[PDB]
Design a binder for this molecule. Structure first.
Ligand code: HEM
Ligand code: HEM
Ligand SMILES: N=C(NCCC[C@@H](NC(=O)[C@H](N)CCCCN)C(N)=O)NN(O)O
Ligand SMILES: N=C(NCCC[C@@H](NC(=O)[C@H](N)CCCCN)C(N)=O)NN(O)O
Ligand SMILES: C[C@H](O)[C@H](O)[C@H]1CNc2nc(N)[nH]c(=O)c2N1
Ligand SMILES: C[C@H](O)[C@H](O)[C@H]1CNc2nc(N)[nH]c(=O)c2N1
Ligand SMILES: OC[C@@H](O)[C@@H](O)[C@H](O)[C@H](O)CO
Ligand SMILES: OC[C@@H](O)[C@@H](O)[C@H](O)[C@H](O)CO
Ligand SMILES: [Zn+2]
Lengths: 407, 410
């Protein structure tokens, strides 16, 4: 059926036909919606490869061409002979750009076509992976003028020689459990922070310690590496009015770079494919800094602001939240590091949706993730109905390595 | 089949079995999620089964399942249906049904209060004046001088679909909206269409920014009639700010009693098309949506100007700043006038406790995450981190088309 999506603020209505090309299951059923659940063979492969190649040739205006047909047969024969196949560079670039295009949970997709793709399929060792990652970090950081990029390591073969970056992001802060029963640093990485130690790393036991990379190549055990500090751009956080803010001793890194997802293109699985763009302010100020299970700084900040924390109804958390988020944005802009606020990012996404609907017939989007975690309804995406469905190429979550690695 | 729900802040996982009793569709498929889509005469045949399901639920709830009273009631209802094509609920069943329609409302964050609902039986009502009297009584009881009490008034159920009782207003109390020839809007833009109908029906509009609308009541399928709610029954709160003495000069105020009046209540297959209900406000409904939605009063700029915030660039988060103060103002004003209200931190915290209690005593709690999470400060409220399962259980409150679009005029 042809579904329609309405924005309840502008009344603009869009019709979605793209969803009619979805194949994978959503997790929901006619009886129960699971929209808020965080994570709901040669025979198998050729169909997948065919679906992919078809859309590629269609995108280059050569659908049904001999070239299209020729390639189809070559891959076909390749799979029949090798049980797998290799992607042409052009297909690789198109696939990664489209996996981002299809990421229903990403609000910054208006930038999808500008992705710099780094082919690391010729990599063979962890040191090799370290080199490639360093190069990615430097390229993307670009002295503060961030540029989107993805580095793609060798695809899965028999699942016993998988390339994996054990970190969750190329750059993250360590977390340590202390006597107080309390947590020092970032609670979200406590387990990884330990595995590095359990593997040799010498933790500075600080509040913002850049974690080391733990890289795995060809199934072998992972190895540690310290990203050259000169390559990790960090931003000290200060407020444009509260001089005491700096005394909080807060800082964040300028490069957001998911490193543990799985990229699927034409049935091929790329288990190590770190990518990066740049931050939307709220990611840091709202979630990293204020989540109860993260740096949880609202109470300290509220205290330094001297407001009545006695009654929830004084909205002191809300007041403080805004200030913390003003300071994150201020600092990044001051140090000339790329960053986007939730208002501009959501406005761009709405623009992107319109482009997509008219040029592609739709845009899968996950409302639950697209709406910023603060000031939801004053951003336009809150008022925008969205259809969530799965299209490939795609980025998917995958088991953490330490729960599957056979040392 | 068991379904797990996890809270990503506490790691607490809950198990849902209640969804098994869900019969109605969600709008979603195994291929597409419509979780953020705002809205994606029965026959003797599909009536008794619906009645039976309900009565079994009712009798089981009172620990009398399988009793002779239970079996007699089922036989009594089947006969009434066969004989009259419909059936009347006992008072005890109507009350039970009403409370559960609220209990099953997946978009409602205030459900911890469901068992405390005052049900007014208006099934003997036959005219619009009768409806007015009933509604007036509801407003005075519910308002209770500012100490709000949840209530619902239930008018005659649908019979042939030609004699429906309807409250044409969206809420019993709402402010008028007027589209000006220059294209601007006076009052609440949300009610412009309904306001025009009222004017066309004879209402003499004061043409102000906060004019309480008249009630447009339809009894027995007859054309609607206008009534003015006694002013002394309409409690309103002037909005001022604890620290900004200029806030009061913004000339803002809101009514204290939120009373949805256009939903359809379904109990045992019976359809009650006029069932106004009311509880009390969560601050953000007024302070975030009614005041700051671009399509509503949209006061963000005027507030931001007075606070003299840098409005040159969004990254100064001037909108977010103005938003908090305005919301602070709404809560401060209601509390100072002793009119019941609840803030989003308090309300969401209670909903989590209620939700956990429901899983333990009922096996589930259908909830719509999209609606449950507050329109501001989303992730600093616990519901943001709470996984939820959305499905439909009956008794239920459902949307129904606006009456002016279906009504056959006499
Ligand atoms: C240009 C800057 C970009 C912005 C501002 C942006 C912003 C966002 C935000 C706000 C999230 C939510 C993060 C969270 O809550 O954990 C997100 C998620 C995501 N984005 Fe983007 N993004 C950008 C670039 C990228 C790039 C380059 C890709 C891939 C090539 C991408 C792929 C995705 C994916 C897969 C997710 C979901 C991740 C998850 O489920 O944890 N993003 N993006
Ligand atoms: C005790 C006070 C209560 C509080 C604080 C509360 C709060 C809310 C809020 C915040 C919403 C969302 C409203 C919106 O965004 O438009 C909601 C939805 C809803 N509530 Fe409650 N509620 C309460 C009592 C009730 C009562 C008494 C009933 C029914 C007997 C009820 C039925 C519903 C329903 C059916 C919805 C969905 C409305 C729609 O879809 O437009 N609530 N409630
Ligand atoms: N600006 C961004 N943002 C994307 C950040 C994604 C975030 N996800 C998370 O933290 C999920 N909760 C991890 C859950 C995975 C389940 N295994 C992470 N890995 O830190 N991207 N750019 O590249 O620009
Ligand atoms: N505190 C509350 N809050 C519930 C308020 C519901 C609100 N919904 C709306 O305004 C939707 N946009 C209407 C969508 C209907 C589409 N037909 C309304 N009609 O005023 N309840 N009580 O305390 O009782
Ligand atoms: C339970 C719920 O799905 C969970 O808390 C989601 C909500 N929305 C989110 N949205 C974004 N962008 N990122 C997140 O991590 C989440 N967490
Ligand atoms: C398009 C989207 O579904 C829509 O804007 C929803 C989002 N969440 C909401 N949540 C509540 N409580 N009330 C609303 O009116 C809405 N509107
Ligand atoms: O400390 C380890 C965690 O960061 C890790 O288990 C993540 O939860 C996982 O990689 C998904 O993000
Ligand atoms: O002005 C008429 C509107 O208020 C009306 O159409 C409502 O949106 C509808 O009754 C749902 O609340
Ligand atoms: Zn769904």
């Amino acid at each position: 059926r042809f579904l329609k999506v309405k924005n309840w603020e502008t009344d603009v209505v869009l019709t979605d036909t793209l969803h009619l090309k979805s194949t994978l299951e959503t997790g929901c059923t006619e009886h129960i919606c699971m929209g808020s659940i965080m994570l709901p063979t040669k025979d198998q492969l050729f169909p997948l490869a065919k679906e992919f190649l078809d859309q590629y040739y269609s995108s280059i205006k050569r659908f049904g061409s001999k070239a299209h047909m020729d390639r189809l047969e070559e891959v076909n024969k390749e799979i029949e002979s090798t049980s797998t196949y290799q992607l042409k560079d052009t297909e690789l670039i198109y696939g990664a750009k489209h996996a981002w295009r299809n990421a229903s949970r990403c609000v910054g997709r208006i930038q999808w076509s500008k992705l710099q793709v780094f082919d690391a399929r010729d990599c063979t060792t962890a040191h090799g992976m370290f080199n490639y990652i360093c190069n990615h970090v430097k390229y993307a950081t670009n002295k503060g003028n961030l540029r989107s990029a993805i580095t793609i390591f060798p695809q899965r073969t028999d699942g016993k020689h998988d390339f994996r970056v054990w970190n969750s992001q190329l750059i993250r802060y360590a977390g340590y459990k202390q006597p107080d029963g309390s947590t020092l640093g970032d609670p979200a990485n406590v387990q990884f922070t330990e595995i590095c130690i359990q593997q040799g790393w010498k933790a500075p036991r600080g509040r913002f310690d850049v974690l080391p990379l733990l890289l795995q190549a060809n199934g072998n055990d992972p190895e540690l590496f310290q990203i050259p500090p000169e390559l990790v751009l960090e931003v000290p956080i200060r407020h444009p009015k509260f001089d005491w803010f700096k005394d909080l001793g807060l800082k964040w890194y300028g490069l957001p770079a998911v490193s543990n997802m799985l990229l699927e293109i034409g049935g091929l699985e790329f288990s190590a494919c770190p990518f990066s763009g740049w931050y939307m302010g709220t990611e840091i100020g709202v979630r990293d800094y204020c989540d109860n299970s993260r740096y949880n700084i609202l109470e300290e900040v509220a205290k330094k602001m001297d407001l009545d924390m006695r009654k929830t109804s004084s909205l002191w958390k809300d007041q403080a939240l805004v200030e913390i988020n003003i300071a994150v944005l201020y600092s990044f802009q001051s140090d000339k590091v790329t960053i986007v606020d939730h208002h501009s990012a959501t406005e761009s996404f709405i623009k992107h949706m319109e482009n997509e609907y008219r040029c592609r017939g739709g845009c899968p989007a996950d409302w639950v993730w697209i709406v910023p975690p603060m000031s939801g309804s004053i951003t336009p995406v809150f008022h925008q109905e969205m259809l969530n469905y799965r299209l490939t190429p795609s980025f998917e979550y995958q088991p953490d390595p330490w729960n599957t690695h056979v040392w």
